[PDB]
Amino acid sequence: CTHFPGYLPNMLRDLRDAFSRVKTFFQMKDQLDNLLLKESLLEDFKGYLGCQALSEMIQFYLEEVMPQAENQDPDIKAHVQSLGENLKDLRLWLRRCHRKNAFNKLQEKGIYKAMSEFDIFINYIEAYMTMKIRN
Amino acid sequence: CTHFPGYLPNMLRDLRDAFSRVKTFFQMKDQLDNLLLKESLLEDFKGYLGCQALSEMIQFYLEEVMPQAENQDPDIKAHVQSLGENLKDLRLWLRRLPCENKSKAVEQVKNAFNKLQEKGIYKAMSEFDIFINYIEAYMTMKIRN
Amino acid sequence: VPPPENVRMNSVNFKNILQWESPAFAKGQLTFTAQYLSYRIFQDKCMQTTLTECDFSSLSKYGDHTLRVRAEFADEHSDWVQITFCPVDDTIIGPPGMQVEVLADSLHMRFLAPKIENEYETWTMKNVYNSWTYNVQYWQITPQYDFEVLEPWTTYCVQVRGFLPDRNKAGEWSEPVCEQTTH
Amino acid sequence: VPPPENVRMNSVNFKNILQWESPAFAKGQLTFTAQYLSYRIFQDKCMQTTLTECDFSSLSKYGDHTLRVRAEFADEHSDWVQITFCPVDDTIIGPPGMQVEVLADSLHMRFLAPKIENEYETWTMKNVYNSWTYNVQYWQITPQYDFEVLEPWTTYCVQVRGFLPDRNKAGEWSEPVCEQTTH
Amino acid sequence: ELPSPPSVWFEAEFFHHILHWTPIPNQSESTCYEVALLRYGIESWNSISNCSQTLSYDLTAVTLDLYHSNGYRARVRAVDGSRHSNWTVTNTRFSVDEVTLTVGSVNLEIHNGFILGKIQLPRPKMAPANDTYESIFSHFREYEIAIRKVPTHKKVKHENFSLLTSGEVGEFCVQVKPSVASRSNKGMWSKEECISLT
Amino acid sequence: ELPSPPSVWFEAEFFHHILHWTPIPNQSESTCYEVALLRYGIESWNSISNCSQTLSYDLTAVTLDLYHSNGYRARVRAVDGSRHSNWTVTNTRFSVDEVTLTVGSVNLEIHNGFILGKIQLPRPKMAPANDTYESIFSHFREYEIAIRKVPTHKKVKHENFSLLTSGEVGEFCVQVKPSVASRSNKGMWSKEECISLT
């Protein structure tokens, strides 16, 4: 990427130390000692397709948990929003890094063409499946 | 796969032959001989991020175009409904093959949180540090190689 | 709003015609729907037909389809029984046919597959099924790859069914297809 | 509703403060907001300050931030100037400091960087940019791997700046620090 | 004015892209017909002749690349001297799946322990001979064999088959119509075969 | 009832996991404290003693796996003979991010043309000796160097450094404070050293 590994350590430092601000609260109230340790991240989702589960993980945190837990206790909320932002910055550093319009140009005729080139689409799903199968 | 390679001939035969019913009308109405043939399908989409795109194209076929082209002309609509059907039947036998082989753990990732909704809100935000240590875990793999 | 019940649908060799036993009572006649899981729309297969026995062979072979349905009055909806079909594996195997020999000195049975009711073309189920292998099992014998080759006057005689090599499964038996013993 | 204009945002060492010269005219004082591209919610991040220049140093230093802003009367909305930031790239580099020698017979300068004004912890610009390497250029010279050690009585004298290997960039020079030549 | 062509259609056999068309109504002795070809990927048609008096003119020689190419567009255009009618063209791209496919040859043989037959896959001489129908449809191909006595059917993906007559005697005749398992192309009944086992 | 323990927290330097807790106020001569431990992945605690009377207790021998292991959680309950109070627990789970880092040793030497410093990396005997300060923190290590005269600092990535004193004279003392740039663990000023170049 754009000489990205020169930034990675500092970004991880920013995520850990930013999290530390709210850790004292949530860790102190998560008393039921459930042991889900998210084992799967490295032992699963590797290879290629599994990875995207971690991109889904990122979006899971940013949307699913951040603005609900933000109101879970409302008085101190900047501490959790700045953490969601601080992981969104890493998602953006994934889009650029390692991890149709011309159709939409003619809307009125592409409706016909997209449903007249379907046989060639079949021929090509056949063609590149015959690559994806041998290797 | 789930004997997906045993079915490979029938699914494509049925998609092409299902397409054949409306082909006369669709190729007849797309008369400007534009040369957009979705060529990139075989020539591109290599790598984890790139490979899933061809699938997105699959979803375009099954979802984006099929159920609109069904009502675009209503008299022959089974013929386009059959296009949506014949791409869901192939996608469903796909992913179940690194081009589409999926992973089910990512749901243990979330539902075990939602198990205790009031308290998982807390625990998902008390296990954050280990999340850091695993994102770092594969960072130091993805860097070495 | 007494709903209809006791649906029995025989999809043997993919002939997907349904029957829901629509109730003929005063509040049991009014409109009903047979929605399907369309690609996106999730549309109705057909409009209220007083006879519940709506065909659903239209469903594709290799995937699966939900049969979400309803029945209703002007101001009330009657209950429904949404059975999802996956005809390749959620089906019965039709009884295969066969061509049978009459020669006394040697019997034969060539197996033939069941056929899907495709209006447009002519098809054999073997396109849909990949490991097809006939099984003749009657008073055990078993067919060769496509057809069976190679007795005292015993009335115990051939019976045949569809079979799949790895999803060993049985169609209606061709018990009717008796064999001719000879001196 | 005469809006404020002539935005100049000074990001030297990540103090992301803007300035628009809020107008004191009849329709130019009342409330305004500075919404941001929050991870998803897209929330507000400052209330009305008579000075348009609300501080925003809180913004992260490696991502990018939308500066969606508005201004309004109770019954009318004013204009706005959405400068998108990416503080790592879209910023100025401060003037370096130094640790300085007093020996006449041999001068030395240990180089020293600008420091980020982080309320929570302590950081140095060198930390943020991993390939940092100073450039001292005066009457061209370039600093030794880390620090400078050691002519006619010439008043042409040191200046120092930050430099980056691949993103060739220059902070403001540390020009004032003249050196004492000697016999 | 002059009438447009009544019907303009593509007859594309295996590497025998023989165009066929209906004539203009009330054609003159001065009437002529054009024949044309176009391949998809090309923005405009290709021409075959200033005059074809015949209803048709093979464009194969230009259309040799029909099988691999993205597709084709073809036409015929009747003409009567100086005054010319308009063309009638194929709205639908000409591909192999429009092209009735066919095989090269079939045979029947009797061996010591079984009968055998070993078919041939069309490879037209005009076609560039390095590439043959056998070569393009590499993994998926499927063709029906009908066997009847002179005075019974199965679907096969292989050029060779054996049958109950393997250790038997009698007069049986065979036809083969090809297809592609991937494509429902409307095969054409290929050359016949028949053999005596007696 | 009797009061539960007020607070239970960790003073864990490099490989010294000494659990610490404040005792009950006005403890009797009969007063005792239980000690317990828990590791994530286990559903229930493990015991260390029926009574610990001291204010603190080393768990190092069971906590040897702290670095690879996700973490640990511990607690105390006060007891006075038969009658026992309820437990007090470590609110913040004890993980690697709690461990205060330090180095093994440092030195000062004078060469013909330069000064040098060459650190040693801690591995305690109780630790499983395969692992050491070098072994867990495989890629990143970063430590500040302080050099002062008897009566000055920079950030470096490497175990070895030379400095302006390379050609100089004087009495200088050294401290080294380690860290990990990818991490926020609060390093500690490591063992001192001092040498005169004068």
With tokens 């999926």, the residue in question is B102
Chain B touched by F68 (CB under 8 Å): no
| Residue D107 · residue D101 · CB < 8 Å | yes
Report the chain A residue with the minimal C-alpha distance to residue E98. Answer: A119
Do both E59 and E129 map to the same domain? no
Do both E74 and E45 map to the same domain? yes
Do both C32 and C68 map to the same domain? yes
Helix (H, G, I), strand (E, B) or coil at B136: helix
What is the 3-state composition of chain D as percent helix, strand, coil, each rounded to the nearest 5? 5, 20, 75
Which residue among C93, C120, C143 closes a domain? C93
Output the six-digit token pair for C12.
């043997």
Do both C52 and C66 map to the same domain? yes
Do both E173 and E145 map to the same domain? yes
Establish whether chain E is in contact with chain C, requiring a minimum of 3 CB pairs below 8 angstroms: yes
Output the six-digit token pair for D159.
């200046």
> Which residues does chain A have within 8 Å of residue B51's beta carbon, measured at their own beta carbons?
48-49
Helix (H, G, I), strand (E, B) or coil at F105: strand
Do both D86 and D33 map to the same domain? yes
Q: Domain locations in chain A?
A: 1-135
Do both E80 and E175 map to the same domain? no
Chain E touched by B35 (CB under 8 Å): yes
Do both D87 and D107 map to the same domain? no
Which domain does D183 fall in, by range? 97-183
> Which residues does chain F have within 8 Å of residue D110's beta carbon, measured at their own beta carbons?
154, 164
From CA D21, how far away is CA E4, in angstroms rounded?
75
Output the six-digit token pair for D132.
């940092």
Chain B touched by C130 (CB under 8 Å): yes
- Nearest residue, CB atoms, F184 vs list A20, A28, A33: A20
Report the chain B residue with the minimal C-alpha distance to residue F68. Answer: B133
Report the chain E residue with the minimal C-alpha distance to residue B31. Answer: E91
Helix (H, G, I), strand (E, B) or coil at F117: strand
Do both E118 and E152 map to the same domain? yes
Output the six-digit token pair for A132.
């994806």
| CA of F87 vs chain D CAs: smallest distance (Å) | 34
Which residue among D93, D112, D134 closes a domain? D93
Establish whether chain D is in contact with chain C, requiring a minimum of 3 CB pairs below 8 angstroms: no
| H or E element, residue F77 | strand F72-80
Which domain does F194 fall in, by range? 101-198
One DSSP character per residue, C67-116 reads: --EEEE-SS-EE------B-TTTSS-BPPPEEEE---SS--EEEEE----
One DSSP character per residue, E95-139 reads: -TTTSPP--SB---EE-SSSEEEE-B----SSS-TTS-HHHHS-S
Count of structural domains, chain D: 2
> Which residues does chain A have within 8 Å of residue E71's beta carbon, measured at their own beta carbons?
120
Query: Cα angle vertex D134, ends D132, D140, to 5°?
Result: 135
CA-CA-CA-CA dihedral for B23, B28, B34, B39, to nearest 10: 10
Do both C133 and C155 map to the same domain? yes
Which residue among C93, C111, C136 closes a domain? C93
Which residue among F66, F100, F134 closes a domain? F100
* Residues ≥6 apart with Cβ < 8 Å to E23: E5, E6, E31, E33, E55, E78
Output the six-digit token pair for E26.
């009330």
Number of Cβ atoms within 10 Å of the Cβ of B59:
12
Output the six-digit token pair for E124.
């037209």
* Residues ≥6 apart with Cβ < 8 Å to F134: F121, F141
Give me the phi and psi of F95, to 5 degrees please. Answer: -125, -175
Among A24, A28, A35, the strongest candidate for a mutation testing the F interface, having the largest count of F CBs within 10 A, is A35
SS3 track for E1-41: CCCCCCCEECCEECCEECCEECCCCCCCCCEEEEEEEEEEC
Establish whether chain C is in contact with chain A, requiring a minimum of 3 CB pairs below 8 angstroms: no
Do both E90 and E106 map to the same domain? no
CB pair distance less than 8 Å for A26 and B105 = no
Q: How far from E128 is each of A110, E67, E103, E133, F157, CA to CA, in Å? A: 35, 11, 16, 11, 66
Do both D103 and D174 map to the same domain? yes
Do both F79 and F117 map to the same domain? no
| Residue A36 · residue B123 · CB < 8 Å | yes
From CA B136, how far away is CA A90, in angstroms rounded?
12
Count of structural domains, chain F: 2
Which residue among F100, F129, F145 closes a domain? F100
Chain F touched by B130 (CB under 8 Å): yes
